Amino acid sequence: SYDRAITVFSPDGHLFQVEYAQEAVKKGSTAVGVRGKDIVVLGVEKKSVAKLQDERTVRKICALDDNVCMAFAGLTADARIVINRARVECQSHRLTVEDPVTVEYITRYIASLKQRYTQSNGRRPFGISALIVGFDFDGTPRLYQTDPSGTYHAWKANAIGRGAKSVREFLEKNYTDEAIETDDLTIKLVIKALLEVVQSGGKNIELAVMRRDQPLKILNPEEIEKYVAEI
Amino acid sequence: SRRYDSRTTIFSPEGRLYQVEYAMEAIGHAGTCLGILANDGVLLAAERRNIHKLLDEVFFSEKIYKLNEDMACSVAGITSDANVLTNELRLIAQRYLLQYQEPIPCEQLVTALCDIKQAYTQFGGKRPFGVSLLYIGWDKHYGFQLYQSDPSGNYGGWKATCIGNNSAAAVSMLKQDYKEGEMTLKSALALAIKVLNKTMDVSKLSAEKVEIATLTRENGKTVIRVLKQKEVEQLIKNHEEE
Amino acid sequence: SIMSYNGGAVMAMKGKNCVAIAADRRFGIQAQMVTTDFQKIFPMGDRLYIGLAGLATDVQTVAQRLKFRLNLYELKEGRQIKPYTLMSMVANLLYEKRFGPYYTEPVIAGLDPKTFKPFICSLDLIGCPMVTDDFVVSGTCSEQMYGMCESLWEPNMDPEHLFETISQAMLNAVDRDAVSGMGVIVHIIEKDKITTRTLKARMD
Amino acid sequence: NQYDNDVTVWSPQGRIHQIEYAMEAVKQGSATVGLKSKTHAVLVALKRAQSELAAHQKKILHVDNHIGISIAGLTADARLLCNFMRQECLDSRFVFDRPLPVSRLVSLIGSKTQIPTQRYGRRPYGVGLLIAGYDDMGPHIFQTCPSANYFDCRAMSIGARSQSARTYLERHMSGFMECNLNELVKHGLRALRETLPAEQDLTTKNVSIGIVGKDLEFTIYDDDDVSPFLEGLE
Amino acid sequence: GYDLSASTFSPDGRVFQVEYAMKAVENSSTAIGIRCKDGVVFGVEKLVLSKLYEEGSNKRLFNVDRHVGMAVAGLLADARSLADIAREEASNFRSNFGYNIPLKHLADRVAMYVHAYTLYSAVRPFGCSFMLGSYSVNDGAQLYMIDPSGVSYGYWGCAIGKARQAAKTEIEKLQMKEMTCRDIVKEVAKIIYIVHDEVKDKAFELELSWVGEITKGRHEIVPKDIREEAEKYAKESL
Amino acid sequence: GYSFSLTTFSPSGKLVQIEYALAAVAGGAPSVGIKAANGVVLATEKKQKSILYDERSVHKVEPITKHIGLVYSGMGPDYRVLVHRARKLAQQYYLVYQEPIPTAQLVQRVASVMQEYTQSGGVRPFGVSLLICGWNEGRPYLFQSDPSGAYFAWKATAMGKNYVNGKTFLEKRYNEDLELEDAIHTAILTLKESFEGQMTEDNIEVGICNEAGFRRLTPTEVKDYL
Amino acid sequence: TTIAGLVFRDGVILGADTRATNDSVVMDKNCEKIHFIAPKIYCCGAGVAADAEMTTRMAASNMELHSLSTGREPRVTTVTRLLRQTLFRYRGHVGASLLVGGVDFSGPQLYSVHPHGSYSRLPFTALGSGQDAALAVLEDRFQPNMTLEAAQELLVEAITAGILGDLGSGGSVDACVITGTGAKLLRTLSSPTKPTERPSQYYFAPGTTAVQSQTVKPL
Amino acid sequence: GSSAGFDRHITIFSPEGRLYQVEYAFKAINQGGLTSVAVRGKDCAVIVTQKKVPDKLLDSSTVTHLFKITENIGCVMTGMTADSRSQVQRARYEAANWKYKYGYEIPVDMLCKRIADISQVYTQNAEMRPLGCCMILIGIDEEQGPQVYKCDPAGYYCGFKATAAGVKQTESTSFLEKKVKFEQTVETAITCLSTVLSIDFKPSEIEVGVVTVENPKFRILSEAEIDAHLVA
Amino acid sequence: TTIMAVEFDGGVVVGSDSRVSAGEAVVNRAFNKLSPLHQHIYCALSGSAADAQAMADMAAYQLELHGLELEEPPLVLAAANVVRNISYKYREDLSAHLMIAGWDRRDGGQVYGTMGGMLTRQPFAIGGSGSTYIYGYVDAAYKPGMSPEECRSFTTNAIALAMNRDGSSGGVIHLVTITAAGVDYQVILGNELPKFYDE
Known part of the structure; x- marks a missing residue:
């Protein structure tokens, strides 16, 4: 069995492997999450959109449970593994506590799994960052973000992947209480925030929202097109 | 021993995995495979590289493997690696059938092999599988389907794709000619020959240098079948006329 | 006894360039009947069938596990399995659980994939094959089946005569067995065709 | 350069750099003295303090009723070894219903710490030890090293500038056997104070004492309890 | 770097790592073993690095069995573990066959264990050389020596340490075959005092142990009175 | 043992360790296989360094089962390991199916053992190529398994030293209709094309496979053929 | 089951009946009980049919590997040792009663192997349920160094006694003759029993059985 | 002489397909400074070796390169002493195990092959190095007669009429070559060693192990037995 | 089964019957219960055939x-x-006593009883199911300083007396004399067995 230490400390207390994993997240397609009043919206860029590719197979916005979904950035293959782990954990929690897991609880689990991979023998860190949204039993909307190191915070509006900083700068100066007043407005914010980086605005963005109680919904090309015309 | 370790599953300073990238270089040099999905079926068409006159023919095909009753795949890159993966897909499909008493849906099969491929990239210290696959299948959820996976353990559904030598060229040629929803197996097969005539630098295509499986439905039964040389010859003939 | 827990009878008969396989259709727990169309004979090729009698749960498990192995075997080697090879595969599968065996006595009936030569055999619970040139029986009413086969079976019977022989053997044999009955399914395996028939039988 | 990274790599001079680097850890530690008379065995250590608001680090640990130790070097390793020693002593009392002879316990330590100095990937224990005990062969003062070697001594000193204490120890060791408890503790203190800077002096804050004798279980004296021994020093 | 691992042969077919371990035994005190007419005598020039150390500390003479003694040179920690290995062997042999292990067999077994640490990069070769001596009525007197490589040979007289090249010539000029334990104890002591360096490597103690007819086959430290005489005859005759 | 791969991809996408294992094969002594209509021949140079080597002691052409035989080019002691493994694989197959393992199923299993030493921890590939011949389902079979674990079915091929010249010679001389007895002649002639001096019936070894089974020609028989 | 063996002047002769039964019902009227171990070594099996079958196949497979690697004829002693070491391992749970007979470099050898792992090298033996009848014949007529034909006759009579005296045995008599030269596997050396010539008769026509449903699938 | 990566430190293939580490292990055999010679006769097999005891205090009886594997199998080791002893012990274990599971004494060719198989593993596994020794086995086969086999560090083994190992391996082979193209066999062997060493050693300078058809049991000649062949 | 071994100045005399039984049926009437572990060391097997044979083979291998x-x-x-x-290690699994008799150059001819893991050296030893009937006889007939010829006679007589009384014993008497010179076998057939009161 391979027991070599891959993630180790450097002279100035830096974990090179973890920073290299963060570099992989920077080359990932932009993903934006906005926490609205009664809704949660996720928006990922489609980067190179070919005309011969089945759109439904490369979605970067998956569902972990009825109330929890997530968007990622970085290594797609790595993301799949993490998503499956989370899904299994969600069913385990639902079976031992007889209740839907809270957004923060599953966020905590994924973050913990990522940290475990930065201090274990024979493995490298996961090369992805995730945006976790959803609603808890009481009805309050949640938005979390985990990274390769294993750290996680709760946000109002965040952006990961290539151009995360650019989108973050625009989100700060555009996120207010009069920007998430209505469901439509909240979605427009994410679309407008995604238009700051994603080239050829229109069908280059993958959007999906999660309204209170109902299952995850995915906006269609023409449904997103209409929103773009209003902006 | 740290001294001799090659360090296969660690990131580079730009967040790249070199072994995976170099496994991919292998593939771009393998024989060309192309997949086209039609309304009435799906097909694979592969350049043969086993060409020497003293090769015996004894086998179904060089690079096209049947995975279960409803799917096949063709492979590009390290042949002996492909043998490991193709045997594993057969095992995965039979595991599913044993458990659910139903054929494995095509995307579930692809995903489960790709999990095996991603694990080699992340832990264990071994080199990755130097293989890309194209998979063709029919299932009751999505019907006719075509997938591609690569040594990173990444996969994606396609209408038409190509891997191996001169894939980039094949793709731009498929982007010009592939008609979404308007494609028939006859049309698909024609396009295959067109794309294969251009990705192969032997001018005359030759029905000895290619391998073509088609996958169709007849009476609620999937039918996978390697085209015989006559049919391919005719197919080639038909391209010459154009 | 565990073998009579669900009941059931299976028999295979050899004819002139043709094989016949029949079985009862009753699925019951002890004295209570649950269904009257439980599958006991499974296809293992165009002209190859396996009949399984014994514990219903093991009948289904063995059939499914054998299919798993046969499918993989037929993907690896690019050909249809031979009747004799299938027998060994089943024997090996049954012998693996030597000290915790599957409660099922299988009977195989078919024709060689390339030569179309009739072949029938039976194996015990632990996997001891027994190839015969006349007939093989298995189930709760094996004794009754032996009597019928021993006196009714003739050499070189044609498809029609073979059908009548195995039908009469099974029908009269299951009528003296309380846990076997509720219909009879017969499969006639020939070079170019397979004929499946359900006989008019007692439903008590 | 190519020989001082692994413990399993013999250098061309016939040395093992990694074991030598692990011995440097004991030399950087705070000094501690160990001496014995005819009926007693005492340990005296200088407690170090990270800052003025910090408590002085523990340096004298309990092993058993007849055995006590003084550490120098990596504290984590010292606690590791201590645990091992405690278990061995407990095992001896469970099986044979008698205290484990100090000499036998020292040999177990030697063997345990020797293993890691021959296996690839492993490292030597980075802690030096001073062991005081009392069994059927009288009082003992043992000194364990990071390279699995141990010496039976009349008096010993390890840690930063322990050579000065050793020099003092050698000069006054002739009257140790006939020394009494109070007298024997003074010598240790005097030798322990020799490794200290001209300005600094031994007080009831940076001094810890541990004694074990004929009719006395291994006890440790801290701060206010070390006043009596401290009162009288010239 | 051809000399970094024991599982790597150099271009001229040498295993440098094992040779480096032999260098560690080369820069150490000298121990001697002499096979007389009815026994074996061991003598070590124990170097007292400090005056604080108790008389009899860091013993380089061990009892691996009732009838077997061991004299070592080199890394004491490595030597100590080898002594425990030797003890294990002897004990295991008695439990399996019901009698005292023959010296030759014991030496062969321990040598193979030593040889096992000279083929891989996972472990390093032992940094010590030792001698095995024993006496029985059915075997007579036997003396063997094992080094870091694992080679085991039987001897009449042997020396290990920094002054083994000089001690061998001193052992050469002796008629040990017709000598006895009682008479060889004075010669061993004398020889040790001769090879011992005055200026360099100052302050040493003399360790003496024997096994033979005089001790009725049991290996033990030479008696104080006899050692006194031997040391008195060593200093007076030097 | 080392748990990491010793064979890994280069930036050009090559696995040099396997390229280097192939260099070992190509410097090996020559080997030839020919599949005739009614059989296969395997033939190899077993020139010994001296005349002290008891030539009859060790055999490069080896049976696996009644119906399968092997020869190799490259590293003799690596060949030994493979021979033993093929023999165990053929037995394992026979114990399950109670029919002797088809040649192509033996080739796949052995080739698979070869691929594992291109990826498993701490080991180097095999410095050997195999030619395997067999007779099953009234058809003769000849295969080559290389160090990468790839296999190919041949009508005729040559390997070891001077294989490229050898193949060109077999292009020109092989035909499908060719009977065994003739096949044997052109086997022995392909060897002659690269042989040093004076091919005796003790410094080549020859095995044949047909309906009757696989066997090593006896030196007495090789002599007749010479 | 009645199996027997005997060492004659130029080799060994094995014999067995061909009846396989389930408790008290004849399942197989012609099962082969003389299994091939090697070219000059055969084995008769008694006890649990599945065990005997799997054990001999395993022994034959292992002997083949050994013969292939050594390149020499397998010894009979290697076979018996392989068998007893395996059987002893399972502590009699593998019910295999074997009679190994063969001719190797050291000559003709005959062994009786029991389920627990014990073995016996003898000039003549017998195992199975009809083992006492066959032994009776042997004790009464066995002579050392018998001629090939005289041995066959004796073995046939020994097996015959078991066939007629033991309810567990019946059918035909199989024999196996092994010498330095060749091996003669005489499946059905004698057929001492057969059924009647059928006094009456009963047959069915092409519609005597009432059919509920039919399904024909052309191939 | 191409080289890349770590192909000279561990047993991996170099650019030309060579195994440098294994080649270095052959150079380790000559480090002992000895030469061995084994000669197969018509009804016997003899093994002669250079017995050098340059130390005086060394017990000459414990110094030998000839070992008894089984009752009928003897051998001579050449190369690294410690490695040789471990290989001798392995051979003895293999032989005893063979008889225990097969019921008959292991043939010399099978024993040599078994030791060679074990040596092959070292050339394929990088974690451990090959042994720096050479094994030569002699024994009487019941069907083939006298046998002489030798395996090396590369895992290669073969049957021989006469073969040598050590520092003067190339010279012993050239001397035995002309001879092939009891008493004479023993003489030829001794001659070959003496010829390439130019010393004409006395009875206590060499060791002799033999196995004849009449006396199959491995035997070691004494001082008086060795001198007798030296006087003639 | 009846086995016996007697010590004498210069070696040992080991002997046994040749009956292998399965209930009331004699499965082997000419079985040799004396097995050589080494050149000068023999063992008499008693108890379970499979166990005794398994252990004897194991010991022979280890001793070899x-x-x-x-x-x-x-030794x-x-x-x-x-x-x-x-x-002793497999006392709960094995059911056989391997009597040990032989000769070495250190302690001459010795007889050891190893039944059930317990080891004891005796002047003479008897084991097996038929040994119970001859306990009184050997106690009254054994005399110290018996010669090899007298030991064989003593052994023969004792075993013959046991064979006639014990149903699990019978057949012929296998005899073995071990000494420095070597091992010399001897078989006493049914017609040449010592006769006693059989009425």
Whole structure:
């Protein structure tokens, strides 16, 4: 069995492997999450959109449970593994506590799994960052973000992947209480925030929202097109 | 021993995995495979590289493997690696059938092999599988389907794709000619020959240098079948006329 | 006894360039009947069938596990399995659980994939094959089946005569067995065709 | 350069750099003295303090009723070894219903710490030890090293500038056997104070004492309890 | 770097790592073993690095069995573990066959264990050389020596340490075959005092142990009175 | 043992360790296989360094089962390991199916053992190529398994030293209709094309496979053929 | 089951009946009980049919590997040792009663192997349920160094006694003759029993059985 | 002489397909400074070796390169002493195990092959190095007669009429070559060693192990037995 | 089964019957219960055939290796210790007594009883199911200083008396005399067996 230490400390207390994993997240397609009043919206860029590719197979916005979904950035293959782990954990929690897991609880689990991979023998860190949204039993909307190191915070509006900083700068100066007043407005914010980086605005963005109680919904090309015309 | 370790599953300073990238270089040099999905079926068409006159023919095909009753795949890159993966897909499909008493849906099969491929990239210290696959299948959820996976353990559904030598060229040629929803197996097969005539630098295509499986439905039964040389010859003939 | 827990009878008969396989259709727990169309004979090729009698749960498990192995075997080697090879595969599968065996006595009936030569055999619970040139029986009413086969079976019977022989053997044999009955399914395996028939039988 | 990274790599001079680097850890530690008379065995250590608001680090640990130790070097390793020693002593009392002879316990330590100095990937224990005990062969003062070697001594000193204490120890060791408890503790203190800077002096804050004798279980004296021994020093 | 691992042969077919371990035994005190007419005598020039150390500390003479003694040179920690290995062997042999292990067999077994640490990069070769001596009525007197490589040979007289090249010539000029334990104890002591360096490597103690007819086959430290005489005859005759 | 791969991809996408294992094969002594209509021949140079080597002691052409035989080019002691493994694989197959393992199923299993030493921890590939011949389902079979674990079915091929010249010679001389007895002649002639001096019936070894089974020609028989 | 063996002047002769039964019902009227171990070594099996079958196949497979690697004829002693070491391992749970007979470099050898792992090298033996009848014949007529034909006759009579005296045995008599030269596997050396010539008769026509449903699938 | 990566430190293939580490292990055999010679006769097999005891205090009886594997199998080791002893012990274990599971004494060719198989593993596994020794086995086969086999560090083994190992391996082979193209066999062997060493050693300078058809049991000649062949 | 071994100045005399039984049926009437573990060391098997044969083979293998390692004929005590260890280690699984008799150059001819893992050296030893009937006879007939010829007679008589009384014993008497010179076998057939009161 391979027991070599891959993630180790450097002279100035830096974990090179973890920073290299963060570099992989920077080359990932932009993903934006906005926490609205009664809704949660996720928006990922489609980067190179070919005309011969089945759109439904490369979605970067998956569902972990009825109330929890997530968007990622970085290594797609790595993301799949993490998503499956989370899904299994969600069913385990639902079976031992007889209740839907809270957004923060599953966020905590994924973050913990990522940290475990930065201090274990024979493995490298996961090369992805995730945006976790959803609603808890009481009805309050949640938005979390985990990274390769294993750290996680709760946000109002965040952006990961290539151009995360650019989108973050625009989100700060555009996120207010009069920007998430209505469901439509909240979605427009994410679309407008995604238009700051994603080239050829229109069908280059993958959007999906999660309204209170109902299952995850995915906006269609023409449904997103209409929103773009209003902006 | 740290001294001799090659360090296969660690990131580079730009967040790249070199072994995976170099496994991919292998593939771009393998024989060309192309997949086209039609309304009435799906097909694979592969350049043969086993060409020497003293090769015996004894086998179904060089690079096209049947995975279960409803799917096949063709492979590009390290042949002996492909043998490991193709045997594993057969095992995965039979595991599913044993458990659910139903054929494995095509995307579930692809995903489960790709999990095996991603694990080699992340832990264990071994080199990755130097293989890309194209998979063709029919299932009751999505019907006719075509997938591609690569040594990173990444996969994606396609209408038409190509891997191996001169894939980039094949793709731009498929982007010009592939008609979404308007494609028939006859049309698909024609396009295959067109794309294969251009990705192969032997001018005359030759029905000895290619391998073509088609996958169709007849009476609620999937039918996978390697085209015989006559049919391919005719197919080639038909391209010459154009 | 565990073998009579669900009941059931299976028999295979050899004819002139043709094989016949029949079985009862009753699925019951002890004295209570649950269904009257439980599958006991499974296809293992165009002209190859396996009949399984014994514990219903093991009948289904063995059939499914054998299919798993046969499918993989037929993907690896690019050909249809031979009747004799299938027998060994089943024997090996049954012998693996030597000290915790599957409660099922299988009977195989078919024709060689390339030569179309009739072949029938039976194996015990632990996997001891027994190839015969006349007939093989298995189930709760094996004794009754032996009597019928021993006196009714003739050499070189044609498809029609073979059908009548195995039908009469099974029908009269299951009528003296309380846990076997509720219909009879017969499969006639020939070079170019397979004929499946359900006989008019007692439903008590 | 190519020989001082692994413990399993013999250098061309016939040395093992990694074991030598692990011995440097004991030399950087705070000094501690160990001496014995005819009926007693005492340990005296200088407690170090990270800052003025910090408590002085523990340096004298309990092993058993007849055995006590003084550490120098990596504290984590010292606690590791201590645990091992405690278990061995407990095992001896469970099986044979008698205290484990100090000499036998020292040999177990030697063997345990020797293993890691021959296996690839492993490292030597980075802690030096001073062991005081009392069994059927009288009082003992043992000194364990990071390279699995141990010496039976009349008096010993390890840690930063322990050579000065050793020099003092050698000069006054002739009257140790006939020394009494109070007298024997003074010598240790005097030798322990020799490794200290001209300005600094031994007080009831940076001094810890541990004694074990004929009719006395291994006890440790801290701060206010070390006043009596401290009162009288010239 | 051809000399970094024991599982790597150099271009001229040498295993440098094992040779480096032999260098560690080369820069150490000298121990001697002499096979007389009815026994074996061991003598070590124990170097007292400090005056604080108790008389009899860091013993380089061990009892691996009732009838077997061991004299070592080199890394004491490595030597100590080898002594425990030797003890294990002897004990295991008695439990399996019901009698005292023959010296030759014991030496062969321990040598193979030593040889096992000279083929891989996972472990390093032992940094010590030792001698095995024993006496029985059915075997007579036997003396063997094992080094870091694992080679085991039987001897009449042997020396290990920094002054083994000089001690061998001193052992050469002796008629040990017709000598006895009682008479060889004075010669061993004398020889040790001769090879011992005055200026360099100052302050040493003399360790003496024997096994033979005089001790009725049991290996033990030479008696104080006899050692006194031997040391008195060593200093007076030097 | 080392748990990491010793064979890994280069930036050009090559696995040099396997390229280097192939260099070992190509410097090996020559080997030839020919599949005739009614059989296969395997033939190899077993020139010994001296005349002290008891030539009859060790055999490069080896049976696996009644119906399968092997020869190799490259590293003799690596060949030994493979021979033993093929023999165990053929037995394992026979114990399950109670029919002797088809040649192509033996080739796949052995080739698979070869691929594992291109990826498993701490080991180097095999410095050997195999030619395997067999007779099953009234058809003769000849295969080559290389160090990468790839296999190919041949009508005729040559390997070891001077294989490229050898193949060109077999292009020109092989035909499908060719009977065994003739096949044997052109086997022995392909060897002659690269042989040093004076091919005796003790410094080549020859095995044949047909309906009757696989066997090593006896030196007495090789002599007749010479 | 009645199996027997005997060492004659130029080799060994094995014999067995061909009846396989389930408790008290004849399942197989012609099962082969003389299994091939090697070219000059055969084995008769008694006890649990599945065990005997799997054990001999395993022994034959292992002997083949050994013969292939050594390149020499397998010894009979290697076979018996392989068998007893395996059987002893399972502590009699593998019910295999074997009679190994063969001719190797050291000559003709005959062994009786029991389920627990014990073995016996003898000039003549017998195992199975009809083992006492066959032994009776042997004790009464066995002579050392018998001629090939005289041995066959004796073995046939020994097996015959078991066939007629033991309810567990019946059918035909199989024999196996092994010498330095060749091996003669005489499946059905004698057929001492057969059924009647059928006094009456009963047959069915092409519609005597009432059919509920039919399904024909052309191939 | 191409080289890349770590192909000279561990047993991996170099650019030309060579195994440098294994080649270095052959150079380790000559480090002992000895030469061995084994000669197969018509009804016997003899093994002669250079017995050098340059130390005086060394017990000459414990110094030998000839070992008894089984009752009928003897051998001579050449190369690294410690490695040789471990290989001798392995051979003895293999032989005893063979008889225990097969019921008959292991043939010399099978024993040599078994030791060679074990040596092959070292050339394929990088974690451990090959042994720096050479094994030569002699024994009487019941069907083939006298046998002489030798395996090396590369895992290669073969049957021989006469073969040598050590520092003067190339010279012993050239001397035995002309001879092939009891008493004479023993003489030829001794001659070959003496010829390439130019010393004409006395009875206590060499060791002799033999196995004849009449006396199959491995035997070691004494001082008086060795001198007798030296006087003639 | 009846087995016996007697010590004499210069060696030992080992003997046994040849009956292998399965209930009331004699499965082997000419079985040799004396097995050689080494050149000068023999063992008499009693109890379970499979167990005795398994242990004897195991001991022979172990002793063979031991002998070659030490380059000297093994001691009789070593052989007994090897058997004792196996018999003691598997005392709950095995059911057979391997009597040990032989000769070495250290302690001459020795007889050891290793039944159930317990080891004891005796002047003479008897085991097996038929040994119970001859306990009184051997106690009254054995005399110290018996010669080899007298030991064989003593052994023969004792075994013959047991064979006639015990249903599990019978057939012929296998005899073995071990001494420095070597091992000399002897078989006493049914017609040449000592006759006593059989009425």
